């Protein structure tokens, strides 16, 4: 019955199940959760691990003895449960000092503090076992056109990430960075707003091999984009270092619904792609149990994230295994798409009369693609109606 | 009185002023326009040049004789007016043969034909003096998840662009390519849906220096994105080879309104950025006079494109030259954003107590950004209400 | 195996399976279908009936003998198959004369012609058995703010609909009108853009009982709205006279995907609502088989519309029948929502100290809503994973 | 120089200039503002009045003594400045007790409490002189399909508004209600999501004359709708009792930018419509100075709201008074749109050969609308470039 186990590599942020329910129109509906309790409860649900922002684990402004005690308690819970910490990140968005950004704040002193706050937490992440360090620049951007020179900001962003790469290299760490794009919210427009913009930026870093993306389902959908397509481009580029799973109903505020909610068909095609491609990273849920829920509803929502992934994994596997689907894929020429267009080379293509002077455009145009029957087989499999 | 001159480098596609008004729910409302007339009338309006798809200039399926005559008549009009042809492109979207794409059609024979059709028109573009060859892959994509393996499609897209780069290099042509992103329409989702995705793809081509972007105002806005921000990233990357100017009311079908319509404030910030950055390429309008209009309205709409650019250029220049605006920019620390964050280097940053232990977080947080006064100065300048 | 039969009341527009594939960037990919063939093929698939615009059945500009022969052939096909015609409509959008609208064209002569064209087709619709006459005002609206005075346009729209109501009343017809809202496309903004605006307008007609709505899944979703919620308000108002079923991926051009595609979860909740409420009207599909398809794909796509409705009907029925769901609905207080708030009346409510002075806000606030477990039961049922 | 005066009837909510800057990813950036200071500073800026939620003026849970003192201090500031309070509203969204709604909470006890809390504040509103009592049901709705039976919820919403209408009638109060639609946020979908849905609902209330709409610029734009068009329908219905002015960049989270920001052209057409129609109600700003700002920026942003309204009023008046614009309006037949279509009556229309058999369709279709020249005149006027 679709029970998750640690082999599935499902992970959750402390800030997910720990979200107290504050929204901009509403006060908290749930009391604060001790990270120790979250580790224990998530382990009981079959999770593989947890993730954290610095400020989720160590209250901002803590002394060293407070910091040590908070980390000690968390480590003890990890050791007790066997839960891993595959990824961590920096909170460079909540505190008022970051109201104009961290790495791209107009004020240089804030930019430097943001880097120092990040570097301190990279050390802690490595200590606790993280393989990926995520950066979500939620405050990098603007509400008005004059407030941020984006060319200068990209220079500052490159400088920051280059320094972080120099740091991890100098320390001999194996951890790598994953940039998490988002188009807007909390800023009117956020810099590096989609997977594409982040991938493009990475190519201009000094050590691009150290950086990939951490795409989030709902974020790309807030720009109306096809999340499986974006993941495909990230995989094509060798840059899918981590992924954030949740649900979103199209173009509106960032809903962070449990995975499977929002665009269910997109969730199906996403799981099909991750499993087919052999993605081996964490299946991380960056979601919020709605503020209508008590703690029983928190754990039900987290359990649902994993359950929906596993149902979709079964259905996508059954789809790909079905001989009738394999036939429909051939009927739609998915096999031909994987063949090189012109491995014979440019000169041969130019000399091939069948490619132009003798090409029967009307006969080619008459061929149906058979995509509707293929998609109805996919629907039948998703719904278990085969 | 905001009169365009050819030195402004305003250009128009033949298919813009020549759009006959067919939409998916409506038949054509205007008769066909002779390209010769378009050249002459656009010259009278102060345009610098025109652009074309192959099939706009030469009816699809024309004999070599008919093709020569169509080109000859067009060249005579260019020669008589001094009008230029700075850009050309291929129609790989109208004919039914391209219903599943050109370079990424599932059928391999179609992919080879698309390349041959493109190569033939590159030759014609060079004959006419085009400096940029645009590719808008409007049929590259899918309506359903199983129809298109996006990793394979990106392989085919790269193969195609690599072959085109080999062709131009082998022939010694100075022309360069510009990929035009669009998120959707006519396909449910289009491959390379935004400026970011196209920039990222270009970095993986064999000869990336031959390829840039041709972003279109309305296309990025169909994903709810900030067009000036995207242009800034293209400029930062050295990839703004060409630009398409029009208007769009947010997230809906591609409207192709005249430039200045749609998001007027975004148009202001775009013109400010292009002029401030010293962009020297064509200011090309890919717009459609609404089908409500007769030909007097066609030419009025084309004139309006250029007029609005020039008004916005004046207001943006006045904004930048106003000492009160410059003071506001300094108050908001836009000048400080241009200073390197840590040119002192990583070790110095790590050793700098002013960047962490002695950083006064609450004093920094108390500093206002003064962005609202700056933005109201921008509004006052845009509206001529200073 | 989810086979449709005529008892299911599935209907299709001639223009759906008959769409030749022309889009604004592409020429037709399929030859024209004879309505006689469409009637026969749809009957073979298990449809209950067909619908038409005047211009789908009778080419615009036909003589009376041509009109009679076209109607005769269509009637013979209806008689041969037993297919019904439950609804018909007027094409007031394709021909260039309607480029500024029909009933709200600025030109009064066009407004009067639009009414005469509609009235002629009302007579034909009644002859062929239609119970509903749909009006989709796809050209009523504007691309620019000055082009249409919306207060005047609403006066003209009310006048037109009032005259149509006078006509049907004077003739003694039982047919009723259903206004089909759409937010945009082909006009930049369309008048009466959502179910709400149409419902509000109807209340100001002279004989409001003669008018309801014909909401379309994709149209409300083009404004990002919740289609089941809109249908609920239409049912609450007694105004769901007809419905158009299809799929849409959120906020973009009108995709007209087959029903079940697009927002699958919304399709589930829609079918649950229609079946629970006892909606007895046609389940009409206003969709377009993608232009990638040949005619085998056309019929597969139409069959898929019906199949998906039937799968969702089974899953929603199983959801409502499940004792565990009935328990979850109680846990979430859906039963309490159906109870009057204050059937004791205003004075009793004002005098009830338990409603205010003695109301324990913190105890009430602590109660979880249990909505996540309820929604995961719904997901499990939709996916057949119970 | 576009200086506001109290006779302009500009008003502001206490919660606007008093927003402390908490967003869902960020803590407050500004300290709390005393309502007395807001009254005095807004008066100095030229405002006419202020508005309030109960909980903005009186901390939730205050004793009767504390409540009296808070109101007394506020009234003293109003009396000292001559500032008015034209509108008031209830906070039925912040406290956790309202997490599933007020009037449509599933729990019946919460619905009764919400009504009592509202009624208490209606009394206070009357004491302070409010002519309109706004209801923004920000928590009425759902994140999941099973959580909220929308027909039952509309029954509960109608019951609540009917009881409130009975209350004001029984007390002899002249105050009227204005329902503020919003499509989403903080709920995944909000009930009565647009102006249209609210207008439709009002027509089914027991005393519809007591209820109108309070539309908000940004809210309709969050559904991609045309705000001036929606206001036109509200005016056509006699239901524009109040209006909320701000800015929004299309389809994303509710930005509450200062008026004139966001869609500047829509702001122009809105001001044109309100002034042309003779709207006499408050011009109320429901906006938030961005959290980047200090208090100097707060007051600059508030001043900017009024300044932009006044600039746009000037430009719209100049547009309407320009004989060249009036000529363009006639050329586009805006005057003809005001003529009744068929005041001659149904029979005369049916008998009029000029409306059908002798209507020259091709001559009518050939007439251009001249909308582009008209819109460029509007652009020129907006930008002061005539
Ligand atoms: Mg998110
Ligand atoms: Mg995330
Ligand atoms: Mg376009
Ligand atoms: Mg273009
Ligand atoms: Mg549609
Ligand atoms: Mg329809
Ligand atoms: Mg708002
Ligand atoms: Mg408001």
XYZ file of N, CA and C in Angstrom, chain B residues 141-228:
264
model
N 7.885 21.595 -29.601
C 7.248 21.420 -28.297
C 6.179 20.343 -28.347
N 5.122 20.546 -27.560
C 4.147 19.486 -27.363
C 2.888 20.008 -26.688
N 1.788 19.261 -26.864
C 0.551 19.471 -26.125
C 0.361 18.442 -25.022
N 1.120 17.339 -25.044
C 0.954 16.210 -24.134
C 2.328 15.678 -23.754
N 2.414 15.057 -22.571
C 3.712 14.750 -21.995
C 4.454 13.635 -22.697
N 3.736 12.696 -23.295
C 4.386 11.573 -23.933
C 4.864 11.820 -25.347
N 4.449 12.939 -25.956
C 4.679 13.192 -27.372
C 6.113 13.573 -27.700
N 6.867 14.090 -26.731
C 8.145 14.738 -27.005
C 9.091 14.428 -25.853
N 10.145 13.672 -26.136
C 11.206 13.448 -25.165
C 12.114 14.662 -25.250
N 12.082 15.493 -24.213
C 12.703 16.807 -24.306
C 14.215 16.700 -24.329
N 14.795 15.706 -23.663
C 16.241 15.526 -23.771
C 16.638 15.185 -25.200
N 15.904 14.259 -25.835
C 16.194 13.951 -27.233
C 15.965 15.177 -28.103
N 14.883 15.914 -27.846
C 14.599 17.098 -28.648
C 15.715 18.134 -28.520
N 16.265 18.312 -27.315
C 17.361 19.259 -27.161
C 18.599 18.758 -27.887
N 18.830 17.442 -27.871
C 19.910 16.880 -28.688
C 19.716 17.234 -30.157
N 18.480 17.071 -30.671
C 18.218 17.369 -32.080
C 18.343 18.863 -32.359
N 17.904 19.694 -31.415
C 18.021 21.141 -31.572
C 19.483 21.563 -31.619
N 20.299 21.019 -30.712
C 21.725 21.314 -30.727
C 22.364 20.834 -32.021
N 22.026 19.624 -32.460
C 22.582 19.111 -33.703
C 22.286 20.068 -34.848
N 21.034 20.527 -34.941
C 20.637 21.421 -36.020
C 21.417 22.726 -35.965
N 21.460 23.369 -34.796
C 22.178 24.636 -34.697
C 23.667 24.448 -34.927
N 24.229 23.318 -34.497
C 25.645 23.055 -34.762
C 25.905 22.924 -36.259
N 25.013 22.240 -36.984
C 25.183 22.105 -38.432
C 25.077 23.461 -39.114
N 24.162 24.313 -38.656
C 24.040 25.648 -39.238
C 25.286 26.485 -38.968
N 25.867 26.340 -37.777
C 27.110 27.030 -37.481
C 28.269 26.531 -38.323
N 28.332 25.215 -38.549
C 29.321 24.663 -39.470
C 29.122 25.231 -40.871
N 27.870 25.360 -41.308
C 27.603 25.889 -42.640
C 28.108 27.324 -42.785
N 27.717 28.214 -41.872
C 28.134 29.604 -42.016
C 29.653 29.735 -41.918
N 30.294 28.953 -41.043
C 31.756 28.965 -40.927
C 32.405 28.480 -42.225
N 31.903 27.380 -42.788
C 32.472 26.833 -44.023
C 32.348 27.805 -45.183
N 31.299 28.611 -45.202
C 31.070 29.551 -46.284
C 31.749 30.891 -46.052
N 32.273 31.129 -44.854
C 32.901 32.404 -44.552
C 31.932 33.548 -44.352
N 30.690 33.260 -43.967
C 29.696 34.306 -43.790
C 29.861 34.966 -42.423
N 29.629 36.282 -42.358
C 29.733 37.001 -41.090
C 28.441 36.964 -40.269
N 27.376 36.426 -40.840
C 26.069 36.412 -40.196
C 26.126 35.585 -38.923
N 25.319 35.985 -37.936
C 25.214 35.275 -36.671
C 23.749 34.936 -36.422
N 23.521 33.972 -35.533
C 22.188 33.457 -35.240
C 21.633 34.057 -33.960
N 20.311 34.226 -33.928
C 19.635 34.703 -32.726
C 18.399 33.858 -32.496
N 18.367 33.182 -31.365
C 17.263 32.304 -31.007
C 16.207 33.137 -30.301
N 14.967 33.016 -30.754
C 13.849 33.773 -30.205
C 13.028 32.859 -29.309
N 13.073 33.029 -27.992
C 12.271 32.192 -27.099
C 10.803 32.593 -27.134
N 9.948 31.625 -26.810
C 8.527 31.890 -26.566
C 8.019 30.768 -25.681
N 7.144 31.038 -24.697
C 6.826 29.958 -23.751
C 5.792 28.970 -24.250
N 4.884 29.449 -25.086
C 3.769 28.662 -25.587
C 3.152 29.425 -26.742
N 2.331 28.714 -27.527
C 1.500 29.219 -28.617
C 2.355 29.386 -29.876
N 2.198 28.509 -30.878
C 1.062 27.596 -31.051
C 1.133 26.248 -30.353
N 2.299 25.795 -29.916
C 2.345 24.560 -29.142
C 1.942 24.810 -27.692
N 1.427 23.765 -27.047
C 1.014 23.911 -25.657
C 2.137 24.382 -24.753
N 3.334 23.841 -24.945
C 4.560 24.363 -24.379
C 5.617 24.296 -25.470
N 6.391 25.370 -25.596
C 7.445 25.479 -26.598
C 8.785 25.235 -25.924
N 9.677 24.559 -26.638
C 11.022 24.338 -26.142
C 11.819 25.643 -26.145
N 12.702 25.773 -25.157
C 13.448 27.006 -24.919
C 12.479 28.150 -24.664
N 11.712 28.065 -23.578
C 10.545 28.933 -23.425
C 10.840 30.359 -23.019
N 12.057 30.673 -22.550
C 12.376 32.022 -22.104
C 13.810 32.356 -22.512
N 14.144 33.647 -22.386
C 15.513 34.115 -22.596
C 16.511 33.251 -21.841
N 16.201 32.905 -20.588
C 17.150 32.141 -19.798
C 17.425 30.779 -20.400
N 16.366 30.073 -20.779
C 16.546 28.744 -21.341
C 17.346 28.791 -22.628
N 17.115 29.810 -23.466
C 17.860 29.931 -24.712
C 19.322 30.251 -24.453
N 19.600 31.176 -23.526
C 20.982 31.493 -23.187
C 21.707 30.253 -22.674
N 21.029 29.449 -21.859
C 21.642 28.256 -21.302
C 21.967 27.247 -22.393
N 21.037 27.063 -23.324
C 21.227 26.154 -24.451
C 22.402 26.581 -25.309
N 22.529 27.883 -25.565
C 23.586 28.378 -26.443
C 24.949 27.995 -25.905
N 25.106 27.999 -24.583
C 26.414 27.721 -23.993
C 26.875 26.301 -24.262
N 25.976 25.413 -24.692
C 26.309 24.026 -24.987
C 26.436 23.745 -26.479
N 26.333 24.768 -27.317
C 26.573 24.613 -28.742
C 28.075 24.501 -29.000
N 28.430 23.915 -30.151
C 29.848 23.706 -30.447
C 30.591 25.026 -30.625
N 29.956 26.017 -31.263
C 30.542 27.334 -31.519
C 29.667 28.418 -30.893
N 29.639 28.525 -29.562
C 28.639 29.409 -28.928
C 28.748 30.862 -29.338
N 29.922 31.313 -29.776
C 30.102 32.703 -30.162
C 29.245 33.095 -31.353
N 28.742 32.122 -32.124
C 27.921 32.424 -33.289
C 26.441 32.630 -32.966
N 26.032 32.482 -31.712
C 24.615 32.453 -31.358
C 24.312 33.395 -30.201
N 23.225 34.136 -30.342
C 22.703 34.982 -29.291
C 21.202 34.823 -29.210
N 20.538 35.758 -28.537
C 19.084 35.723 -28.410
C 18.459 36.880 -29.176
N 17.206 36.653 -29.590
C 16.302 37.674 -30.116
C 15.061 37.694 -29.228
N 15.133 38.307 -28.053
C 13.985 38.275 -27.144
C 12.882 39.166 -27.666
N 11.640 38.784 -27.356
C 10.458 39.548 -27.745
C 9.703 39.965 -26.489
N 9.363 41.260 -26.406
C 8.673 41.821 -25.239
C 7.528 40.916 -24.821
N 6.601 40.693 -25.741
C 5.394 39.975 -25.380
C 5.639 38.547 -24.946
N 6.670 37.908 -25.503
C 6.926 36.503 -25.192
C 7.323 36.315 -23.744
N 8.275 37.101 -23.258
C 8.645 36.965 -21.858
C 7.459 37.320 -20.964
N 6.652 38.309 -21.371
C 5.499 38.721 -20.580
C 4.399 37.660 -20.571
N 4.337 36.788 -21.578
C 3.434 35.636 -21.552
C 3.773 34.624 -20.469
N 4.967 34.685 -19.905
C 5.334 33.923 -18.721
C 5.323 34.791 -17.466
N 4.828 36.016 -17.566
C 4.766 36.887 -16.411
C 6.110 37.428 -15.980
N 7.124 37.339 -16.840
C 8.473 37.716 -16.476
C 8.715 39.200 -16.759
N 9.789 39.715 -16.160
C 10.205 41.106 -16.303
C 11.104 41.204 -17.528
N 10.592 41.823 -18.582
C 11.350 41.867 -19.828
C 12.647 42.643 -19.671
N 12.667 43.852 -19.100
C 13.952 44.526 -18.865
C 14.953 43.681 -18.096
